[PDB]
């Protein structure tokens, strides 16, 4: 074993973005970058062909809500992925037929941005302004909705993921 080295930092704030016409200078509050770098999740109903091709794309990074806890507590079209610390999270989304495994640096720490007290406060999530290309998704794993668990033959690597740390 050996004690785990620190993150590799970048400059750019929104890296791995998957659309850069994200505006950081619109983002309230003022963001606390996630300075880590582990494994992050995200339940998406939308599947690996098209998810590996793409990245992750947000919806409106011209128009979208670029406030973190509107965003967060009432889900309108914004300039967010979002994504989870919590690998398990997969298990309170119904219905939600793929846990995504990510590779991404920064991204917006909701909690450490607007506090832990929120009614969202459990989903402890970072939010990826301008989303995340393919080349930070690190695969897949397909979710059994009647158990609520991953079907771990059937999980996917992305062949585009390229490590960095």
């Known amino acids: 074993k050996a004690a785990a080295p620190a993150c590799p930092r970048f400059d750019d704030p929104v890296h791995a973005a998957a659309d850069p016409r994200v505006?950081?200078?619109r983002i309230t509050p003022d963001p606390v970058w996630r300075t880590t770098c582990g494994t992050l999740y995200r339940s998406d109903s939308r599947g690996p062909a098209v998810v590996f091709e793409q990245g992750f794309l947000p919806k409106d990074v011209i128009d979208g809500q670029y406030d973190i806890e509107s965003y967060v507590l009432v889900n309108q079209p914004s300039p967010?992925?979002?994504t989870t610390y919590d690998h398990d999270l997969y298990k309170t989304w119904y219905k939600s037929g793929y846990n995504?495994?990510?590779?991404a640096p920064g991204g917006?720490?909701?909690?450490?941005?607007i506090g832990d007290r929120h009614k969202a406060a459990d989903q402890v999530e970072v939010a990826?302004?301008?989303?995340?290309?393919?080349?930070?998704?690190?695969?897949?794993c397909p979710v059994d909705k009647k158990t609520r668990t991953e079907k771990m033959?059937?999980?996917?690597?992305?062949?585009?993921?390229?490590?960095?740390?």
């Open 80 to 82: 967010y992925v979002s």
């Open 23 to 25: 505006d950081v200078e």
């Open 100 to 103: 995504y495994y990510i590779d």
């Open 153 to 165: 033959s059937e999980c996917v690597g992305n062949p585009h993921y390229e490590p960095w740390h």
């Open 128 to 140: 990826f302004p301008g989303g995340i290309r393919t080349e930070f998704v690190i695969g897949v």
């Open 108 to 113: 917006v720490d909701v909690n450490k941005t």
